[PDB]
């Protein structure tokens, strides 16, 4: 999904709000901040109502201006609440009644997702690959800066996981794929407009093709 959450390479932001080793304070800066992660785990591990991938996608589905003005932990409160409503576990009415006011949610999905690709290749360390020049309106774990770009395999995972584009929509056809650490030269991604060396992206097999 080409949403505003795909931030890598966006220009115009100011300084990172940190100096190295500065005191970052407590883990949680408010008494509710542990709730989104804890209730995500309730949903995933206890209820089996959704996957972690579905949580990523529902946050991506926040209305774009809403996403941009909402602090991190609050996005996950909104995302988990949205999933609970979409899965028929909770109603928006009861959330707003208990909250004592408006509780706007993420927008409905505009894609049913897609299955794990049928045709993929097992790649080896050192092989050159290109990121498939594909556009996916639903969940995908490929940041746009690498779409269509060429890099070299530095690692093939020894484990396999469900394809995000499927499990992020709760589909039954996510299968399993390993992922690959693909190293791109900075200039491959941003031309002359970068001060870096290389960027390594961890890409599902189904996002790749021989170069």
């Amino acid at each position: 999904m080409d949403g505003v959450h795909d931030l890598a390479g966006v220009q115009g932001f100011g300084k990172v709000p940190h100096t190295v080793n500065a005191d970052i304070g407590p883990t949680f800066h408010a008494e509710w901040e542990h709730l989104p992660y804890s209730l995500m785990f309730a949903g995933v591990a206890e209820l089996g109502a959704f996957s972690v991938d579905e949580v990523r996608y529902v946050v991506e589905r926040m209305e774009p201006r809403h996403y941009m003005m909402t602090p991190y932990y609050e996005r996950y409160v909104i995302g988990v609440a949205t999933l609970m409503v979409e899965k028929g576990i909770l109603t928006q009415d009861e959330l707003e009644s208990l909250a004592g006011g408006p509780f706007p949610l993420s927008r409905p999905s505009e894609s049913e997702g897609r299955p794990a690709p049928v045709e993929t290749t097992t790649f080896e360390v050192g092989q050159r690959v290109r990121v498939r020049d594909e556009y996916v309106p639903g969940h995908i774990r490929m940041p746009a800066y690498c779409r269509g770009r060429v890099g070299t395999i530095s690692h093939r995972t020894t484990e396999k996981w469900p394809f995000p584009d499927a499990i992020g929509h709760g589909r039954n056809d996510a299968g399993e794929e390993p992922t690959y650490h693909v190293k791109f030269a900075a200039e491959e991604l941003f031309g002359s407009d970068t001060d870096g060396g290389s960027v390594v992206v961890d890409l599902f097999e189904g996002y790749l093709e021989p170069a």
Binding site: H5, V20, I89, P102, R141, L189, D195
Partner: protein, 196 residues
């Protein structure tokens, strides 16, 4: 035009979500409290520091950590949520590694601790992939001209830690002494361990 939607206070919304689920019997007794304790007390960059100090003083462990990070971390019992498949990345005299999740906040929670606000910031997520030298410089870390910066974007299930270079002036230090100078920021890759 472009205005924020009307919203109840965030605390009221977060606790409403808890109460709605809890009132339906869907949240076990002490569940969120248990997670809070895990997040605050167990998931910690002190664990990553321990791993680094061990690698620095034990060549055999160093090689295990760099070839099978998951197995190395398992020896200490530090695998966990958002830290089940671990890859450690080695800094060298010509290479500085830095970790980000440009798409959200993906972090090796059990060994680095939950990500800090700055790491989840739009500023870090947008900029470090494209201009890591300037970002690190602004944050207080000067990377020498003869050092390649490599940014790992945490886009799938691999969870990363940086193994920084061991600084001069620490020769013969105990593991406890070495652990002390390996900070959260060193494990993320934005800082270099400092010797007083």
């Amino acid at each position: 035009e472009n205005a924020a939607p009307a919203q109840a206070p965030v605390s009221d919304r977060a606790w409403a979500l808890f109460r709605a689920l809890d009132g339906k019997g869907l949240v076990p007794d002490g569940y969120v409290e248990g997670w809070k304790k895990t997040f605050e007390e167990d998931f910690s960059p002190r664990r990553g520091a321990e791993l680094v100090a061990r690698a620095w003083t034990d060549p055999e462990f160093r090689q295990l950590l760099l070839t099978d990070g998951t197995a190395a971390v398992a020896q200490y019992g530090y695998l966990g949520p958002q830290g089940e498949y671990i890859v450690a990345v080695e800094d060298t005299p010509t290479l500085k590694n830095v970790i980000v999740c440009s798409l959200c906040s993906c972090t090796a929670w059990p060994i680095l601790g939950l990500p800090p606000t700055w790491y989840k910031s739009f500023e870090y997520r947008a900029r470090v992939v494209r201009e890591p030298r300037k970002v690190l410089s602004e944050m207080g870390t000067e990377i020498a001209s003869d050092i390649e910066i490599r940014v790992y974007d945490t886009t799938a299930e691999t969870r990363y830690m940086v193994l920084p270079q061991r600084p001069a002036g620490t020769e013969g230090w105990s593991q406890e002494q070495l652990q002390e100078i390996v900070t959260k920021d060193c494990l993320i890759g934005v800082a270099i361990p400092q010797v007083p």
